[PDB]
Write a protein that binds this DNA or RNA. Structure first.
Ligand SMILES: [Mn+2]
Ligand SMILES: [Mn+2]
Ligand SMILES: [Mn+2]
Ligand code: NA
Length: 348
DNA sequence: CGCTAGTCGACAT
DNA sequence: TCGACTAGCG
């Protein structure tokens, strides 16, 4: 999550409606709808009580898309990424803390604060997502569980031309190189659209509107893969990259103390972290829904050795990747929880 | 002025 | 899954 990215490129956004993509294909970061839908029933998901309201919550959105002739491809998060294991551990810890806090508040009498702790201990399991998948398949809507992060999968779907837009709330999709991103979409169909090509409209970006430089900026600002340097945001990173008259990024990062004229100590492990973060944004494993195989988000360059890309996702057999993609195989238990077969009547 | 980290929100009666 | 708002510090 690139904090303050949306407001930073505000001049490259515009209010639209979904009808602009009428008759076209659009992929969806479904976990946002899952969270917002789970908020309405936080306490019941906290007590372990049976609840399927979030299903209907996502379904009114899906149906709203179907009403305007849109073809939605619901994309779901899959396995945990090693480049995000720290943030995941932290989030898990906070969810646990809030859960225990709320449960303690139930043993007193405070009902509001307990609900406030329960609405911040929301854990979107893969079973709920599977419920949403079943509900979507009952309506004939394509679904796809990403090998890891849904971000990279959406990015691939958008870059491959399989979809023409990405409905999400996360700003990372821009850093992954998505062409068209639809943000802040209500249940009525109104939202903001940020096109990559329009990134040149932002005067405060300068010449930093190319995919590579924009990615470097987003990384230097501070992402989930790598915490930024102390005192470095979007503006200073963009400033460095604008003053960066050098194709090699490493030397620039080593010269960040010069480009900003500040006292910045940069550890080697932070440089390695930047390389790993960049390679995470570039070559994270996604799933080709047509050829049915595990591929990186972008084709490997000649200046990169895929042997040292374990943090960007581990390769598995294409059959397993397909079973996970369909959602038939649970992410954790790695066991078959469903028996859906797309052949026996997205996947051409 | 820009960056940081904490608070607060998304639901919907 | 995330972002929006802001007091407080450089
Ligand atoms: Mn998760
Ligand atoms: Mn994501
Ligand atoms: Mn993300
Ligand atoms: Na930062």
């Amino acid at each position: 999550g690139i904090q303050g990215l949306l407001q930073f490129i505000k001049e490259a956004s515009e209010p639209i409606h979904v009808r602009k993509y009428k008759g076209q294909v659009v992929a969806v970061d479904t976990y946002c709808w899952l969270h917002k839908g789970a908020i309405a029933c936080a306490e019941k998901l906290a007590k372990g009580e049976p609840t399927d309201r979030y299903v209907g919550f996502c379904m009114k959105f899906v149906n709203m898309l179907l009403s305007h002739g849109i073809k939605p491809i619901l994309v779901f998060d899959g396995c945990t990424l090693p480049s995000k294991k720290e943030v995941e551990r932290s989030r898990r810890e906070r969810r646990q803390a809030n859960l225990l806090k709320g449960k303690q508040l139930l043993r007193e009498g405070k009902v509001s604060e307990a609900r406030e702790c329960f609405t911040r201990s929301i854990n979107i399991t893969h079973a709920m997502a599977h419920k949403v998948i079943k509900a979507a398949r009952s309506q004939g809507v394509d679904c796809l569980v990403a090998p890891y992060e849904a971000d990279a999968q959406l990015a691939y779907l958008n870059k491959a031309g399989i979809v023409q837009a990405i409905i999400t709330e996360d700003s990372d999709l821009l850093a992954f190189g998505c062409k068209k991103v639809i943000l802040k979409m209500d249940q009525f169909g109104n939202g903001l659209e940020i096109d990559q090509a329009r990134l040149g409209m932002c005067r405060q970006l300068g010449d930093v509107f190319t995919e590579e430089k924009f990615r470097y900026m987003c990384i230097l600002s501070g992402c989930d893969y790598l915490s930024s340097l102390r005192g470095i945001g979007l503006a200073k990173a963009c400033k460095v990259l604008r003053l960066a008259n050098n194709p090699d990024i490493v030397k620039v990062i080593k010269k960040i103390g010069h480009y900003l004229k500040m006292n910045i100590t940069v550890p080697e492990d932070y440089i390695n972290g930047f390389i790993r973060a960049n390679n995470t944004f570039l070559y994270q494993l996604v799933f080709d829904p047509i050829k049915r195989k595990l591929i990186p988000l972008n084709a490997y360059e000649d200046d990169v050795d895929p042997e040292t890309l374990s943090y960007a996702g581990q390769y598995v057999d294409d059959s397993i990747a397909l079973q996970i993609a369909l959602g038939n195989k649970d992410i954790n238990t790695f066991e078959q929880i469903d028996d859906y077969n797309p052949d026996t009547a997205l996947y051409f």
